[PDB]
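Anyone? Bumping this.
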Amino acid sequence: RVGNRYRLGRKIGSGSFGDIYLGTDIAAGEEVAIKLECVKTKHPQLHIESKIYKMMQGGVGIPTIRWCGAEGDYNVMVMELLGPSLEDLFNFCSRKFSLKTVLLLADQMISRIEYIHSKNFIHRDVKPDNFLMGLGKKGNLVYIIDFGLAKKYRDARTHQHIPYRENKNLTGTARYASINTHLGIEQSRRDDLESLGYVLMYFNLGSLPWQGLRQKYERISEKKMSTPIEVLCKGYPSEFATYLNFCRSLRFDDKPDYSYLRQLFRNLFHRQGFSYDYVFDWNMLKFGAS
Ligand SMILES: CC1(C)Cn2nc(-c3ccc(F)cn3)c(-c3ccnc4[nH]ncc34)c2CO1
């Protein structure tokens, strides 16, 4: 048991700096997700993440916190249960998302990243595994999770942007990291959106060119810097190359034009003649016997 109304269960995976568990609400009977961090770690970070989660509450696509406290030898946070990550669905769709599905996700993922920025934070871990779909009536709503690597980019009181600086502690997934990260440059808002661009091309292509190579981080960096966007996005609509170029060229402290980025794909969504039924690839899978 955990807290007051939550029972513990399976270990379902590992988040950034912690372990994730299935939980069952005793009062309402609903299922929940629980994060546990051992107390005696010399670098405790669960409480920091929880406060960020609390700051994000009320926004679209932010998981609702049910409880957060201490039990036994663990700090504990309780989230509403959500659906599979975009990586899970990507594998279920044979690692191939249709252009319509990619654009549908892109619109929401940009707004999730914008909302976090609107709360003075940068995610710094933008990857498919950190986007989870909702459940039930929210089955078409993309959530954003795992604020363990998040970091304030402007002062809450004055909005003063953090200074341009060297940050060589490579933090985040290498495959989707911004080139600025590889060059040991402090991440800013442009870096979250640049990482998202690599995610979108990941969905389009099925694998990024710098896949399957401390040593590997340098190799990924070299291939990322040796890959022109024209080569990376060859065969796909120009908006993806336009999106990446806009994020890469964005100034360090500049506020991104989120609306322009979303409209890039929305206009392409309309021009391609796609229905807005909000039907994803995984809603079209067929099933049967073995
Ligand atoms: C394992 C990982 C790579 C990382 N991770 N971490 C969490 C998590 C859970 C509780 C919490 F308090 C903080 N994080 C979940 C998570 C899983 C299921 N339903 C959820 N709802 N909200 C979050 C969430 C996942 C999923 O993907």
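Late reply, but here is one note on the structure posted above: Residues 78 and 271 are 43 Å apart (CA to CA).
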